[PDB]
C-alpha cells in the first residue's frame, strides 16, 4: 500500500480509502474494479528487495496511522506509530508466510521450529488432491473417505482452497494419561 | 501441489540462515531439515 504526506485533511495518509474497498467488493458480488485498477490508480505498488532498503513501512494501517490526542491486558504487547516518514503500508503481515505455513492455526503461539515441522508434514497428509481423481491414472494415489474442513481456519485458506479440498478430520480429542498406551 | 509450484532451490557466504531481506518475499518457516535446510526456500 502507498502512504502519502499529501492530505488536505491532517496527517500523512494511506492512498487506499474506504470507497475503493467497497468498489472492489462490487466486483466480488458479481461472482469492473480489478487489482490492476489499484496498480494504475497508483494506490498500490511493487517493491523489490533493493527498493525495500530506501522505504519505511507501517504494519497495521488504522492502528499505525493517526497519532494519540483502558488498554486490554489479554492482547499481545504492540509498539507504536512514532514515525511520520512512512512511505508504504503492509497489506497484511500474515502474507510473509508461504502455502504450507498458511494452513497452521495460531503460528504466532508456537515455538518457531514446530511451525518448520508442520510446514513439512502437510505434504505427507491425505485428502482430496483434485476432483478428477476418478478419471486420472496416477502411479499411487491416496484419498480420504470423509474429509472435513477445519473448525479452526486461516483467512489465507480462502485463497488456498483448503476448505474446498481438505487434508484432515476434526477429531474429538482428550489430552489424558489413560491406559498408558 | 501448491507448495511444490512455489518452490526455490539455491545451488551450492552463509545461505542457510533466514536473512532480513527475505521479509515478505520467502516463508520464514518453510524449509526442510538436513542437507537441504535453508537452501530450499518457499515463496
Amino acid at each position: 500500500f502507498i502512504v502519502e504526506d499529501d492530505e488536505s485533511l491532517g496527517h500523512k495518509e494511506l492512498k487506499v480509502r474506504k470507497g475503493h474497498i467497497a468498489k472492489l467488493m462490487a466486483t466480488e458480488y458479481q461472482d469492473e474494479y480489478t487489482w490492476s485498477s489499484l496498480l494504475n490508480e497508483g494506490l498500490v505498488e511493487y517493491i523489490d528487495a533493493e527498493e525495500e532498503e530506501s522505504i519505511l513501512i507501517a504494519m497495521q494501517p488504522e492502528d499505525l496511522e493517526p497519532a494519540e490526542a483502558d488498554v486490554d491486558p489479554a492482547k499481545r504487547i504492540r509498539v507504536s506509530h512514532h514515525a511520520t516518514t512512512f512511505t508504504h503500508c503492509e497489506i497484511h503481515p500474515s502474507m510473509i508466510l508461504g502455502v504450507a505455513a498458511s494452513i497452521i492455526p495460531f503460528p504466532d503461539h508456537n515455538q518457531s521450529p514446530r511451525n518448520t515441522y508442520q510446514s513439512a508434514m502437510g505434504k505427507q497428509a491425505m485428502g482430496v488432491f483434485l476432483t478428477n481423481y476418478n478419471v486420472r491414472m496416477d502411479t499411487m494415489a491416496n484419498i480420504l473417505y470423509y474429509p472435513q474442513k477445519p473448525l479452526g481456519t486461516t483467512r489465507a485458506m480462502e485463497y488456498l482452497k483448503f476448505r474446498e479440498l481438505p487434508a484432515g478430520q476434526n477429531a474429538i480429542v482428550a489430552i489424558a494419561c489413560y491406559s498408558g498406551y | 501441489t501448491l507448495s511444490h509450484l512455489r518452490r526455490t532451490n539455491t545451488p551450492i557466504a552463509k545461505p542457510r540462515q533466514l536473512h532480513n531481506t527475505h521479509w515478505g518475499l520467502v516463508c520464514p518457516a518453510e524449509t526442510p531439515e538436513g542437507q537441504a535446510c535453508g537452501l530450499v526456500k518457499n515463496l
Binding site: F1, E13, L14, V16, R17, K18, G19, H20, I21, L24, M25, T27, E28, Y33, T34, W35, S36, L38, V44, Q60, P61, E62, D63, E65, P66, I91, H92, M95, V99, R155, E158, Y159, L160 | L2, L5, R6, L43
Partner: peptide, 30 residues
Amino acid sequence: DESAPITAEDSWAVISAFFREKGLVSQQLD
C-alpha cells in the same frame, strides 16, 4: 465518505482482488 481511511479488516478485500487476478502460480505462467 467515499474517501474515508481504510480499516485493518479491509486489507482482506485487497488481498482477495490480488488472487482473483493473479492466482497462486502467477510467476510460473507469466
